[PDB]
Write a protein that binds this ligand. Structure first.
Ligand SMILES: [Ca+2]
Ligand SMILES: [Ca+2]
Ligand SMILES: [Ca+2]
Ligand SMILES: [Ca+2]
Ligand SMILES: [Ca+2]
Ligand SMILES: [Ca+2]
Lengths: 7, 422
């Protein structure tokens, strides 16, 4: 469970 | 955890692609770049959006440079600010590096091929299929050194070059156990599990052992994909098929386990609940004459595996038998076999599979269905842990036993999945 960011 | 901030020290493939920022961004998710020496790779793509429509970008690719600026070793928030500052309609150039998998179990034996070439492998496979006498060595040397994802792309490249599905082709060229190994490798983890499940329920009699192994050892995440893919292929809910071929309390246990709704690993240890579950398991079985079975099924299916590991230790403070020995005395039949397999997977799942591999080979002949299924289903999961527990218990390596019990290309095919001696 790692941090994601939508680009 | 290999990382570098020099591009000349990367050893994957380099892809250059240009993207135009849409109203909904570039349409991809990035992950990584959080713990000092960490890469930035592509989590997912948006099918509707620009990144996927360009096609050049694949998931698990490492972002090398973003518009002439090398971002190797830049923080997650530093390079996010780059893409977000791009205005709608503006274009970005991305240099991408592939060969470094996004997700991969640290204890699997087969690893993704770095210099992967799905088109070349499909061409080399068709070369070995068409060879007079069939070159089984090449097909084995290829498919056992590629990850399951890489095998899903080779099956795509083979159909795109032959109009013939690679499964049907290799089925006609291979025979015996070697065919069973290769056909199972060409299925996704959910596909192979869903197929071996239905296969265990052909005819009135069922292979309760094969049914017990898969349902007791798979995690919630794995069971969600199994229940989805099972209806996808066999046009029926897996639960439904389970109610049909099973019955009794054994049916309750399989349906509950197969639902894949076990509680996730609790953030805090429930010492108070560990004692309660341990006493409840004691109250519901060995303390009294008789067995409150649903209490066992409820606790052993609804608690997280780390929790249940600690209740089985705490349970020894109430009962003169451990959880294993208590199962043999309080219950019998397929329910007994199911409970024994279940707590083995909870206590030590790699040791569980190591013991199963030993049983399949210790006597006269081989239980090839069990040996092949474990080597296929655990190759990218915990095969190293299985091999580790195996040699500690039995003195010799799992490699050594596959070598004695099996022969031919089939032997070599399983030895590759094992991944060396111990
Ligand atoms: Ca041959
Ligand atoms: Ca055949
Ligand atoms: Ca049946
Ligand atoms: Ca009793
Ligand atoms: Ca819990
Ligand atoms: Ca044997």
């Amino acid at each position: 469970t790692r941090r994601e960011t939508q680009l | 955890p290999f990382f570098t901030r020099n591009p000349s020290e990367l050893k994957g493939k380099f892809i250059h692609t240009k993207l135009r920022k849409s109203s909904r961004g570039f349409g991809f998710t990035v992950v990584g770049g959080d713990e000092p020496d960490e890469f930035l790779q592509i989590k997912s793509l948006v099918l509707d959006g620009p990144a996927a429509l360009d096609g050049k970008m694949e998931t698990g690719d490492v972002i090398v440079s973003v518009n002439d600026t090398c971002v190797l070793g830049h923080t997650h928030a530093q390079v996010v600010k780059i893409f977000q500052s791009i205005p709608i309609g503006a274009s970005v150039d991305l240099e991408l590096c592939r060969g470094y998998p996004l997700g991969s179990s640290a204890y699997g034996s087969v690893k993704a091929y770095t210099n992967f070439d799905a088109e070349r492998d499909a061409l080399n496979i068709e070369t070995a299929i068409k060879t007079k006498g069939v070159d089984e060595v090449t097909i084995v040397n290829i498919l056992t050194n590629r990850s399951n994802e890489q095998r899903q792309d080779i099956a795509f490249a083979y159909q795109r070059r032959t109009k013939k599905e690679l499964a049907s082709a290799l089925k006609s060229a291979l025979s015996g156990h070697l065919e069973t190994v290769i056909l199972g490798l060409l299925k996704t983890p959910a596909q192979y599990d869903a197929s071996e499940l239905k296969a265990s329920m052909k005819g009135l009699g069922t292979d309760e052992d094969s049914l017990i192994e898969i349902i007791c050892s798979r995690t919630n995440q794995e069971l969600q994909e199994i229940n989805r893919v099972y209806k996808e292929m066999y046009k029926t809910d897996l639960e439904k098929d389970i109610i049909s071929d099973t019955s009794g309390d054994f049916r309750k246990l399989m349906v509950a386990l197969a639902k894949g709704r076990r509680a996730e690993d609790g953030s805090v240890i429930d010492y108070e609940l560990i004692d309660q579950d341990a006493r409840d398991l004691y109250d519901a079985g060995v303390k009294r004459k008789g067995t409150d079975v649903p209490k066992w099924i409820s606790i052993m299916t609804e608690r997280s595996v780390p929790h249940l590991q600690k209740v089985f230790d705490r349970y020894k403070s109430y009962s003169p038998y451990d959880m294993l020995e208590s199962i043999r005395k309080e219950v019998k039949g397929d329910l007994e076999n199911a409970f024994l397999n279940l707590v083995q997977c909870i206590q030590n799942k790699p040791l569980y599979f190591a013991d199963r591999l030993y049983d399949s080979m210790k006597g006269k002949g081989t239980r090839d269905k069990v040996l092949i299924r474990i080597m296929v289903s655990r190759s990218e999961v915990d095969m190293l842990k299985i091999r580790s527990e195996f040699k500690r218990k039995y003195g010799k390596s799992l490699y050594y036993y596959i070598q004695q019990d099996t022969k031919g290309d089939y032997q070599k095919a399983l030895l590759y999945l094992c991944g060396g001696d111990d």
